[PDB]
C-alpha cells in the first residue's frame, strides 16, 4: 500500500506536470524578477528534471505549503 | 487450485497503456444499487485462476 517512493516574489519558479501511459513526467525553470506584481510578458521555456513511470489514473491535484 | 493468482473480468471501461487500476471495489452490472455490497448483478471485479 505504498507501491512506489524516492528521494534525491523577487523570483519566479514555473512547472509543468503532464502524464503519458503512465510516465509522469516533470519540467521546470526559475528566474529572479522585477515586476514584483505579476507574469512577465516575454518569453521562457522549462526543461526536464525527472519522468516518473508509475502508471496512475490521474484527473484532479492540489498543492502543499508551510504552516504556522 | 492456487488462488493467490488472479486477474480483473469486469471493468467501466478499458484500460490506457498501462493504467495500473488495482481497486477491487463490487461491480454494479446496472439493474440493482449494489454501492460495494454484494448480490445479484453486484460482482466482484476479479477472478482466481485456482
Known amino acids: ?65 508551510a504552516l504556522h | 487450485g492456487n488462488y493467490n493468482y488472479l486477474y480483473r473480468l469486469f471493468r467501466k471501461s478499458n484500460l490506457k497503456p498501462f493504467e495500473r487500476d488495482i481497486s477491487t471495489e463490487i461491480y454494479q452490472a446496472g439493474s440493482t444499487p449494489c454501492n460495494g455490497v454484494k448480490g445479484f448483478n453486484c460482482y466482484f471485479p476479479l477472478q482466481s485462476y485456482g
Open chain 1, 1 to 65: 500500500n505504498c507501491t512506489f517512493e524516492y528521494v534525491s516574489f523577487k523570483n519566479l519558479r514555473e512547472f509543468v506536470f503532464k502524464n503519458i501511459d503512465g510516465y509522469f513526467k516533470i519540467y521546470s525553470k526559475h528566474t529572479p524578477i522585477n515586476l514584483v506584481r505579476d507574469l512577465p510578458q516575454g518569453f521562457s521555456a522549462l526543461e526536464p528534471l525527472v519522468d516518473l513511470p508509475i502508471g496512475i489514473n490521474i484527473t484532479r491535484f492540489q498543492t502543499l505549503l
